Amino acid sequence: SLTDILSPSDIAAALRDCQAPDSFSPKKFFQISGMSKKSSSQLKEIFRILDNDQSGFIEEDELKYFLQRFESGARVLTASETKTFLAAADHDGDGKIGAEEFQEMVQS
Numbered sequence: 001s002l003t004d005i006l007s008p009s010d011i012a013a014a015l016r017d018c019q020a021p022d023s024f025s026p027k028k029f030f031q032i033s034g035m036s037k038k039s040s041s042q043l044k045e046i047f048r049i050l051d052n053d054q055s056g057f058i059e060e061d062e063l064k065y066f067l068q069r070f071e072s073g074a075r076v077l078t079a080s081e082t083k084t085f086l087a088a089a090d091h092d093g094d095g096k097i098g099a100e101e102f103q104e105m106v107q108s
């Protein structure tokens with residue numbers, strides 16, 4: 001569990017909010033949690049937890065586990081979820097999220 005940036009009650013509320021598949025969104029998890037409220041530097045601490053390759057980015061193969069970061073056991077993302085999130089953070093057309101194009105997708 002993160003517990004290094006956002007509060008638990010805020011996460012547990014955002015998880016159940018749209019726990020169902022293709023029910024949540026990349027820009028609909030900062031209202032219940034409070035990611036945007038965090039600085040671009042604080043939003044990076046999470047990226048280091050999403051990198052299941054330690055390469056430096058969060059490819060789709062590791063982005064589908066977005067629900068496995070706040071729940072640590074929940075289901076993965078679909079072609080209608082991962083794609084969106086990637087098209088909301090990456091915007092570079094690389095298929096991998098970075099620590100420079102992530103925060104931007106949060107606050108902005």
Ligand SMILES: [Ca+2]
Pocket residue numbers: 051052053054055056057058059062
């Ligand atoms: Ca990686």
Ligand SMILES: [Ca+2]
Pocket residue numbers: 090091092093094095096097098101
């Ligand atoms: Ca990228």
